[PDB]
Design a protein around this ligand. Sequence first.
Ligand SMILES: Nc1c(Br)c(OO)c(Br)c(OO)c1Br
Ligand code: BEF
Ligand code: BEF
Ligand SMILES: [Mg+2]
Ligand SMILES: [Mg+2]
Lengths: 207, 200
Amino acid sequence: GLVPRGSHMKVLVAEDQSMLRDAMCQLLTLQPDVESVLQAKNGQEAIQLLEKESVDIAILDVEMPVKTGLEVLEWIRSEKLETKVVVVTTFKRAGYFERAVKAGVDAYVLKERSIADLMQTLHTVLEGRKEYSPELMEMVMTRPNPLTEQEIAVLKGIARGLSNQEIADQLYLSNGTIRNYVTNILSKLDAGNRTEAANIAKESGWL
Amino acid sequence: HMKVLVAEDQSMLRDAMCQLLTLQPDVESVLQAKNGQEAIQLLEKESVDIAILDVEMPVKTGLEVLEWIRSEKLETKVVVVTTFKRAGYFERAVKAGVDAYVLKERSIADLMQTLHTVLEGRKEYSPELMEMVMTRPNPLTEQEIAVLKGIARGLSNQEIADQLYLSNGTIRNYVTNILSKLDAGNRTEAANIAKESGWL
Ligand SMILES: Nc1c(Br)c(OO)c(Br)c(OO)c1Br
Ligand code: BEF
Ligand code: BEF
Ligand SMILES: [Mg+2]
Ligand SMILES: [Mg+2]
């Protein structure tokens, strides 16, 4: 992923707040490692600019008129451009972050960061590495217990070596009902058989 | 030359504004605050020519910093710079004698220009927010407008009453409400005020 243009990078900035866009572009332009900065007020402008010339890094706000930076990210990847993408946003919504990562964003950082932080991010992605907001990583790495009350009881039974039929009896349900829960439980815990499911939910502290 | 303070809770923008201000030839120094409390604390110890204040910030807003600057009677010009178009903010800022109020739609070049403007004793009010706050609905009812137009044609209350098929007491009640609405001393003056206000 390393693009050996760290001393003369061509970037684009899409950001709909005009005072921030202007200030970002002025300071990037002054950096010795930056060759040029293309500026876009919204995601449709970004895309139009990227249709007509190459950039090494696109720096994208999420919330913008017409097309969001997430939509631009997806366009950039669908076009197979040789362009790193750095999302810079105010928003800590987990869904935006997950969407960016599913589109292979190179970095996702918050407007809590400084310009110096941003310059580091741009060198990191151009050298083929990723940078993900620590706060957003944390947020997303902590999951609820995904299991219903019944499913937990089943798993515990499973742990003790019980058959579905034995568990059925214990919970005063039909064998068919227990088999349904197990199916459900395999899918939720991304486990394969019934004993993987059991160590998965215990090791993740869910019983 | 210029000694400025910037108060702005978004870190990336505060950093970028401050670096660019610092680079300006007639800017001497730039003090930074990330909330209004920090801004008041800096202003307690250090003299500043101009304070550039965001509105929405934790703990104390720019509008509260502004008002503090004024009760303290400092020789500090104040420029508010905000994302928000909310009329209330602009109104409160002006009632506290803000020197400039501008939106983050504006450029950094515009901001510099605004700095020179306030230091020259002039004001710079967002053209958009000015137009918004000065644009209100006509304060008169349709019926009141018809009465005023009659008054402007020289008609008596009886003549207007016969024109509108109402009692002259009903016309007298329209006039009474008009006078109070418009704070006018008499019916002919009321018609003058309405006309020149663009309400007929
Ligand atoms: N992630 C996030 C964000 Br970003 C935010 O405000 O801009 C609010 Br507010 C919030 O919950 O109220 C959440 Br969760
Ligand atoms: F407009 Be936000 F910072 F994505
Ligand atoms: F935080 Be805002 F732009 F007043
Ligand atoms: Mg935006
Ligand atoms: Mg703010």
